[PDB]
Amino acid sequence: XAXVXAXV
Amino acid sequence: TXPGVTXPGV
DNA sequence: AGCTCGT
DNA sequence: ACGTGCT
Numbered sequence A: 001x002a003x004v005x006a007x008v
Numbered sequence B: 001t002x003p004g005v006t007x008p009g010v
Numbered sequence C: 001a002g003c004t005c006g007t
Numbered sequence D: 001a002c003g004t005g006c007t
Ligand SMILES: *C(=O)c1cnc2ccccc2n1
Pocket: A001, A002, A008, B009, C004, C005, D003, D004
């Protein structure tokens, strides 16, 4: 849920 | 999920 | 109750 | 170095 590297 | 049963995700 | 990735 | 979004 976070998008800090993936943003899922 | 869904909604319902968002996504995932969002 | 109901889930998911890496830049 | 980080949790998200309604039925
Ligand atoms: C989004 O909040 C979120 C939280 N945990 C995870 C674990 C593994 C892959 C993706 C994820 N996304």
